[PDB]
């Protein structure tokens, strides 16, 4: 057939050693990566229809009154938000006699490998957002908060990091850490050089690295949480919900036709005429994070943060930037790149003209800054639909 | 320590790895396409016309077809053996759990897989009537699983099972759809993965060892695990006889007719059609062909291949396949000499019968342990030590020469007077353990009637 | 959980897909044209003369015609009585429904489908007041259907069926006239009038299990659905022998006759009528022909093919067709010789007899389950737990040598002074469970006279 | 769409298609509208009115 093709398995190079005294399974392969978000977010029942989440909102109230003062009138209020599933899928192909032989158990092994890849794709879509389908609402890296943990974790998590949550009125309930964090917990020392997170004579593994709690909150460990320059998270993991409409749903054919090319330029091959078997796999996840601001990103040493500022349609009035809660003077939607830089460094604390950076044209600014950045657009008299987001580490 | 939900995937991996061995003997019993069977003298486009061969099915069937179990003997306390097959006797309860599980049916299937793959497995549980079933909820659910579905890791020191996994596949997609794990003090099951993926369930058991017994075709002590009964000798004469049938089959199409040639006479002198290189000569029976001078022409033939040159090799491979199997010579039609007399029958069967009697002993040991575990599983406490001595009673595997036994059993009994007691006449007749109990009840009635 | 209207179409689609496997095996039993049967030596204008070979039909008929059920057996609660007589005992109850459905006709047809297709289905229902005239209104209506008309999702985790559908095709081709769907608690029927389903007429049922039971031709334990009995070896020797027969037949039409040539002879000197190419040889007896001798003219001839060069290979394929099926040799007519004595018969049939004993045990498990369901369906409540231990008594499938059996049993009984109670001598003689009751009545009367 | 089968779209479709099969027969046999060449005539071909 189309022998040794990149797209099908055909007694390619891999099976040169087969059906002889080959040394069992090998002694060196690592175990399959478990999903992570699927063990920390609550699973919510999801139909193929998607779901509606209701929410109360009305600021209903009562007033103190004197005798004979006529009593006031009030109204409650409610609102709703929709959530939809999204599909993830793959196909793999092998010669029918390769399926009969099943060399190195490949057609069995492949079903485990695709399951891992599909699990990993969900966690990447939830944590860093790398390829997330448009139906997924929010991802953890989209948070406007960050903290360093380098000199010792205790000050980093229990004091500084928690301050950046409770100042926003958002609580801390779990923390999620990558294996690469172990040296900075082992290196977390008092002034005498005794470790904080392990006891005398040092036989035991360091407390959070046994999934022990830190300051009451459970620790969740992982081998693959880290990306870019972020090594973990702390926050209210009750703010995340996920679902799955159905299972991984393996299906198989000896008889269909596949396009090995693209929709734009096809390259059809019949599975029947070339005598190939193909397996079809799909899963139908869904996700909602109620508020991405409820999480502190953890960083292995100090970083800058960078934001995209969007004034699309802004046509009258002024907007207000704020750094760690300290408001700038107001800015016009038409203002220059250097005007925005001069305004943010005019906040009364810690900022400087040599550390802060601003780039891009009027109304489309990008801001790079040593802190949490927030914006009030309510001074725009016309052209609502303005927004702000994080976009990378600085 | 090890977490069972990790051990699960490790045993599933070892189980899938084992399946690559079993395909080798399945291909001989189902007669699937095999490379070494293909006849080389047949031209490449005729290679689709595969000739299959039935020696391995014929042999493995002819062993498992003869085996049947009648019951068990458990030895008595201080000489009590004349007592009935009823009356709640120790040896009869272990036969009720055989009938109630229809193991009469299922064990003849399980013994066939034990020959095909060299092993099968027997498994034990109390039933869970929390799921609706057609079983008596008191009876221990002794059941049989093939090595295509259950895998068990033997400790080579004790020859005990350490642990075992049963897997089942949902449909033609060949995904796994439940995984049950047996551990020395518990049975734990990822009850289904019916879409979605699983959630666990567990039931601890009264035994101090795994409630799975391998029934295995181990042919001498050097086998820590049974070999397939389809022996390398029989495979090689199976594949040889496939080549000879396939070469002969192709020869009958291409060469059984002597090809006809004319020399000298030109194609233009015959007046062949120049677009297609032929004439439609009329060819009905009476005709004579006149071919002109042909510039000094002559007619001559290539000879036919004669198919008896292959049939003598097919006969030689049939004699070899009879020799290496040990079946009666007429089971492979290697001689038409049917045994004229009741002696000459078991003359010819003698190498089959002595083989089946060894398989009855070798499998009888598995049915000891399957019943000894099932007693402890049900009754709790400990095994009454008479059960460690229990032995299976199988049927006589020879051809049932009924009338030839009636002369002997009559003459040995000679009404009251002869050398055997009545009961021994029934044992020699081969009326079964269950039947000889039915017999006493009818004989009591004929005695009371007078 | 699930919805009938979509489940109906979901099963009906899987059922139509199953019909593409089944007809590949039917093409052997019904002996329709197979692409592999055509004899490649026969020229393209004669390949309309198919030759159809009857090994598949012969084999399935020879098994399926030798299976008979005498009656059920059900064990007594404490072993109190060997048989509890004709006073409506638990076994004669089940036998009443067997006769009341004419199951002795329908079963031997159903067994022929179980052997062709690998499965066929028993089904159980109460008879309607409104529909099915001509049945006893108290008995459960138990009827059997082939896999060309009923289909069931057998559940591999539990060996029950999830659901099943019966599709009635109309008198001609593709039109479904009705579909009936069986649930664990319900049944629904749609008629398909005017191209549309009507509303599902429906009944509950008193089980908690689907009232459909598969007979399956389970060859060995890991054969999870039952294969066809026309195994790949027997298909292969069927198709191989079809080709040899077709070449041999074509040879007699073209080539079994010497072909006669004259060289040197000028067509003009022989007086050929040149616009036709012929002259009329008057053939009668000894009329000597004469010719001029120019160009070295001489007569020579191509030889005929030996038709025997095919026949002596057909005689080899018959010995294979016997060897792979285990039929008595004279069923293939391999040779003239056949067993001269009762002793030689019992040996000659020894494969086919034990093959049928193996099939009887495998189909017995289906008729046990069908009767346990039929019991719940009329009688209600939980089944008396003796019924889990019931057994089916099939007739002895061997050729009945009545004279040898008579001489032998009369010797064992010896006018009551021998080693046998009277009514064991009856079941050795082979008088059936149903027939022996009449001998108890006749003997009870005969004792009033001698 | 097949998993959900909203408003029984699939079941409804088969009934509407089967109706269109029949109308494509009658309008082929009466008035010839799209008759295949295998049909040996249609009633509107009569010379009588």
């Amino acid at each position: 057939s189309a022998d040794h093709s990149q797209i099908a398995q055909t007694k390619d190079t891999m099976f040169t050693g087969y059906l002889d005294p080959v040394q069992a399974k090998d002694y060196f392969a690592e175990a399959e990566k478990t999903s992570i978000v699927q063990r920390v977010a609550q699973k919510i029942p999801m139909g193929a229809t998607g779901i509606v989440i209701p929410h109360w909102t009305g600021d209903v109230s009562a007033q103190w009154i004197g005798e004979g003062d006529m009593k006031p009138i009030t109204k409650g209020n409610m609102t709703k938000r929709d959530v939809h599933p999204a599909k993830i899928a793959t196909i793999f192909v092998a010669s029918a006699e390769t399926v009969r032989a099943n060399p190195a158990n490949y057609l069995g092994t492949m079903r485990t490998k695709v399951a891992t890849a599909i699990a990993m794709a969900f966690d990447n879509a939830a944590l860093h957002g790398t390829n997330a389908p448009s139906a997924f609402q929010g991802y953890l890296d989209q948070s406007n908060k960050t903290q360093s943990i380098s000199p010792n974790a205790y000050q980093g998590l229990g004091v500084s990091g928690l301050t950046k949550l409770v100042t926003d009125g958002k609580k801390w309930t779990h923390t999620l850490l990558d294996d690469t964090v172990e040296p900075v917990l082992n290196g977390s020392v008092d002034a005498n050089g005794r470790p904080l997170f392990v006891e005398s004579t040092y036989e035991s593994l360091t407390t959070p690295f046994r999934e022990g709690r830190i300051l009451g909150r459970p620790t969740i460990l992982s081998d693959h949480v880290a990306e870019g320059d972020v090594v973990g998270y702390a926050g209210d993991f009750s703010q995340i919900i996920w679902g799955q409409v159905g299972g991984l749903s393996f299906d198989v054919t000896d008889q269909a036709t596949l396009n090995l090319g693209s929709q734009e330029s096809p390259n059809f091959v019949s599975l029947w005429q070339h005598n190939l078997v193909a397996v079809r796999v799909e899963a139908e996840y869904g996700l909602l994070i109620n508020d991405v601001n409820a999480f502190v990103k953890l960083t292995f040493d100090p970083v800058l943060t960078t934001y995209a500022l969007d004034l699309d349609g802004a046509s009258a009035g002024n907007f207000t930037l704020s750094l760690d809660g300290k408001t700038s003077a107001n800015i016009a939607y038409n203002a220059s790149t250097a005007t925005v830089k001069s305004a943010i460094v005019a906040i009364d604390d810690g900022v400087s003209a040599d550390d802060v950076t601003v780039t891009g044209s009027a109304g489309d600014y990008t801001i790079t800054v040593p802190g949490t950045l927030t914006a009030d657009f309510s001074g725009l008299t016309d052209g609502e639909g303005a927004s702000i987001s994080v976009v990378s580490v600085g | 320590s090890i977490d069972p939900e990790k051990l699960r995937d490790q045993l599933l991996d070892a189980f899938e790895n084992k399946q690559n061995e079993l395909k080798s003997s399945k291909a001989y019993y189902d007669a699937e396409r095999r490379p070494d069977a293909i006849g080389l003298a047949v031209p490449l486009d005729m290679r689709k016309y595969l000739a299959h061969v039935g020696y391995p099915r014929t042999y493995v069937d002819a062993i498992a077809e003869r085996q049947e179990l009648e019951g068990f003997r458990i030895p008595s306390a201080n000489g009590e053996e004349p007592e009935s097959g009823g009356e709640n006797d120790p040896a009869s309860e272990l036969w009720d759990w055989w009938q109630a599980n229809n193991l009469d049916i299922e064990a003849t299937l399980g013994h066939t897989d034990a020959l095909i793959y060299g092993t099968a497995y027997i498994t034990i549980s109390m039933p869970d009537p929390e799921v609706d079933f057609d079983v008596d909820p008191e009876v221990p659910l002794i059941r049989v699983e093939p090595p295509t579905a259950l895998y068990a890791e033997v400790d080579p020191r004790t020859r005990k099972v350490l642990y075992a996994i049963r897997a089942i596949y949902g449909a033609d997609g060949n995904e796994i759809v439940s995984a049950t794990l047996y551990l020395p003090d518990t049975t734990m099951t990822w009850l289904r993965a019916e879409g979605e993926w699983e959630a666990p369930t567990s039931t601890p058991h009264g035994l101090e060892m795994v409630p799975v017994i391998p029934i295995s075709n181990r042919t001498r002590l050097s086998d820590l695990y049974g070999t397939s009964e389809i022996s390398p000798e029989l495979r090689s004469v199976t594949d040889a006889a496939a080549q000879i049938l396939m070469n002969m089959q192709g020869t009958a199409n291409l060469m059984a007719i002597p090809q006809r040639l004319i020399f000298g006479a030109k194609p233009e002198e015959l007046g062949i059609n120049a677009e297609t290189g032929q004439r439609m000569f009329d060819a009905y029976m009476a005709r004579i062909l006149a071919f002109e001078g042909g510039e000094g022409a002559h007619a001559e033939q290539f000879s036919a291949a004669e198919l008896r040159n292959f049939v003598d090799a097919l006969d030689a491979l049939d004699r070899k396949a009879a020799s290496y199997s040990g079946l009666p010579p007429q089971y492979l039609s290697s001689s038409s000499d049917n045994p004229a007399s009741a002696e000459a029958i078991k003359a010819a069967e003698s190498r089959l019968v002595k083989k089946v009697e060894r398989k009855n002993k070798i499998f009888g040991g598995a049915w000891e342990q399957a019943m000894r575990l099932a007693y402890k599983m049900v009754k709790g406490g400990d095994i009454p030590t008479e059960y460690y001595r229990m032995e299976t009673v199988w049927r006589d595997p020879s051809t049932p020469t009924y009338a030839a036994k009636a002369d002997a059993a009559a003459k040995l009994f000679a009404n009251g007077a002869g050398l055997i007691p009545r009961e021994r006449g029934w044992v020699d007749m081969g009326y079964t353990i269950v039947e000889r109990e039915q017999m006493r009840q009818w004989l009591e009635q004929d005695q009371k009637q007078g």
Side-chain angles (χ1 to χ4, degrees), chain B residues 223-239:
Chain B
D223 288 337
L224 295 186
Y225 312 87
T227 57
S228 177
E229 187 51 43
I230 301 172
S231 59
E233 303 102 293
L234 186 58
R235 295 179 201 188
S236 76
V237 299
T238 299
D239 294 334

Side-chain angles (χ1 to χ4, degrees), chain B residues 30 57 68 96 113 134 136 292 336 402 426 431 435:
Chain B
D30 283 327
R57 186 190 303 265
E68 286 201 311
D96 191 271
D113 288 45
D134 71 315
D136 180 347
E292 215 175 332
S336 200
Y402 179 76
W426 301 342
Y431 307 128
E435 220 296 325

Side-chain angles (χ1 to χ4, degrees), chain B residues 87-411:
Chain B
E87 295 173 313
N88 318 293
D89 177 286
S92 193
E93 186 61 18
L94 301 184
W95 177 259
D96 191 271
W97 304 347
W98 177 274
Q99 285 198 302
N101 289 304
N102 64 94
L103 277 162
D104 286 316
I105 306 181
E106 301 192 333
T108 198
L109 305 184
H111 296 169
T112 305
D113 288 45
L115 297 179
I116 296 291
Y117 303 116
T119 294
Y121 301 92
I122 301 159
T123 69
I124 310 173
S125 183
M126 302 304 286
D128 53 326
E130 293 91 333
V131 48
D132 301 277
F133 288 155
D134 71 315
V135 299
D136 180 347
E138 193 276 340
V139 174
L141 195 77
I142 302 178
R143 189 167 283 174
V144 192
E145 267 86 29
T148 70
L150 197 154
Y151 170 77
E153 298 217 326
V154 175
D155 163 34
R157 299 179 64 254
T158 59
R159 297 84 174 219
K160 200 194 304 169
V161 170
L162 290 169
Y163 34 71
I165 197 155
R166 180 193 71 89
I168 185 66
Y169 295 95
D172 312 75
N174 290 334
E175 73 303 322
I176 180 171
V177 89
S178 71
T180 303
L181 178 71
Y182 308 99
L183 301 174
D185 64 356
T186 190
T187 299
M188 189 162 185
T189 189
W190 286 266
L191 187 61
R192 299 188 184 199
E194 186 183 314
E196 203 63 18
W197 282 118
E198 65 283 343
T201 284
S202 178
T203 54
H205 56 235
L207 305 99
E208 63 280 88
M209 59 168 63
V210 179
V212 176
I213 290 295
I215 183 163
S216 74
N217 191 42
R218 54 191 296 255
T219 294
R220 82 288 190 166
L221 287 319
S222 302
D223 288 337
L224 295 186
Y225 312 87
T227 57
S228 177
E229 187 51 43
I230 301 172
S231 59
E233 303 102 293
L234 186 58
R235 295 179 201 188
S236 76
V237 299
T238 299
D239 294 334
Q243 295 185 17
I244 309 308
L245 283 167
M246 199 181 310
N247 295 351
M248 194 282 278
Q249 184 68 17
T251 303
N253 292 328
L254 289 166
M255 304 194 77
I257 301 304
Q259 181 58 291
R260 292 176 171 172
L261 288 83
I262 304 293
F263 285 98
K266 295 284 170 277
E268 294 172 16
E269 182 174 32
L270 269 288
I272 78 175
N273 169 271
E275 299 101 46
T276 63
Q278 63 199 261
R279 285 191 62 165
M280 301 289 91
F281 172 54
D282 207 32
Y284 302 159
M285 168 157 40
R287 307 301 177 73
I288 303 176
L289 282 159
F291 282 138
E292 215 175 332
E295 208 158 40
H298 67 268
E300 60 188 342
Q301 300 174 241
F302 293 126
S303 306
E306 68 184 322
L307 303 184
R308 45 259 175 182
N309 194 33
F310 288 103
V311 178
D312 284 8
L314 293 174
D315 289 348
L317 294 172
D318 284 347
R319 277 127 59 195
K320 298 317 187 184
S323 172
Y324 307 160
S325 306
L327 297 178
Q330 79 281 18
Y331 280 25
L332 269 62
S333 199
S334 71
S335 177
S336 200
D337 184 10
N338 279 256
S341 67
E343 301 307 324
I345 304 177
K346 53 69 179 182
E349 299 202 276
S350 59
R351 192 146 70 98
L352 174 58
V353 161
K354 289 310 311 177
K355 191 170 293 184
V356 177
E357 290 184 353
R358 184 158 63 157
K359 303 310 186 176
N360 288 348
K361 287 189 289 182
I362 270 57
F363 291 169
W367 295 111
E368 293 186 63
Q369 277 84 253
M371 299 301 156
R372 276 193 265 117
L373 296 174
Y375 180 99
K376 189 176 177 84
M377 178 78 270
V378 179
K379 302 300 186 78
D382 204 1
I383 308 303
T385 185
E386 66 191 51
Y387 285 64
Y388 295 120
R389 295 155 173 76
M390 74 180 277
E391 289 300 337
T392 51
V393 178
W394 298 85
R395 299 193 81 178
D396 175 346
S398 64
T399 296
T401 57
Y402 179 76
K405 292 180 295 183
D407 299 330
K411 284 168 172 168

Side-chain angles (χ1 to χ4, degrees), chain A residues 115-389:
Chain A
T116 298
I118 285 168
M120 282 298 305
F122 181 79
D123 289 303
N124 289 0
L127 295 173
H128 327 106
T130 65
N131 308 80
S134 57
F136 283 17
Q137 293 174 37
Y139 60 98
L140 280 304
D141 277 4
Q142 209 177 15
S143 174
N144 76 337
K145 304 183 176 63
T146 190
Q147 176 61 58
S148 63
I149 67 172
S150 218
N152 70 80
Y154 181 88
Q155 291 290 354
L157 302 179
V159 188
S160 184
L162 178 60
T163 298
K164 305 183 78 164
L165 286 168
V166 303
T167 300
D168 200 16
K170 298 176 200 288
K171 65 172 61 183
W172 172 30
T173 71
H174 293 69
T175 179
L176 171 59
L177 300 175
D178 188 275
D179 277 338
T180 53
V181 178
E182 200 200 325
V184 295
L185 278 159
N186 293 353
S188 65
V189 293
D190 73 14
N192 299 315
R194 316 307 290 245
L196 294 183
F197 285 93
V198 57
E199 269 283 14
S200 188
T201 78
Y202 313 101
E203 287 216 296
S204 303
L205 181 60
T206 307
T207 291
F209 278 84
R210 311 198 311 279
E211 305 222 310
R213 40 174 50 77
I214 299 172
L215 296 175
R217 289 77 174 184
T219 305
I220 312 294
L221 304 173
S222 179
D223 51 6
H224 68 276
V225 152
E227 197 258 31
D229 207 6
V230 174
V231 297
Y233 307 87
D236 183 7
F237 282 68
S238 75
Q239 304 303 323
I240 313 178
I241 67 180
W242 75 286
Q244 170 170 257
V245 174
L248 193 59
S249 302
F250 301 101
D251 193 5
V252 72
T253 176
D254 198 25
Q255 302 199 352
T257 292
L258 298 183
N259 182 6
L260 313 192
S262 177
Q263 288 212 251
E264 297 186 324
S265 60
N267 185 6
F268 293 103
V269 172
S270 175
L271 297 177
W272 183 233
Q273 307 303 351
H274 289 42
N275 194 38
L276 305 179
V277 170
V279 172
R280 176 172 76 184
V281 183
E282 76 188 349
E284 300 187 46
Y285 294 114
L287 173 70
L288 166 64
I289 299 174
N290 180 39
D291 182 4
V292 295
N293 304 281
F295 301 85
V296 164
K297 291 152 64 173
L298 300 175
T299 57
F300 199 83
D301 66 353
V303 297
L304 283 291
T305 302
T306 191
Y307 304 82
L309 196 301
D310 157 34
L311 304 185
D312 186 21
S315 186
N318 298 275
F319 69 96
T320 297
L321 301 181
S322 173
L323 202 182
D324 73 67
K326 302 186 183 90
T327 52
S328 176
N330 51 280
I331 310 176
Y333 54 87
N334 197 31
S336 82
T337 319
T339 303
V340 175
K341 185 172 176 174
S342 74
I344 188 169
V345 306
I347 298 169
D348 204 21
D349 181 19
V351 288
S352 75
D354 49 359
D355 289 356
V356 178
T357 290
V358 181
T359 39
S361 56
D364 300 354
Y365 317 102
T366 54
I367 315 301
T368 301
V369 63
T372 187
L373 206 302
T374 61
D376 180 15
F377 306 117
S378 313
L380 295 179
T381 296
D382 195 12
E384 68 174 315
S387 79
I388 189 176
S389 181

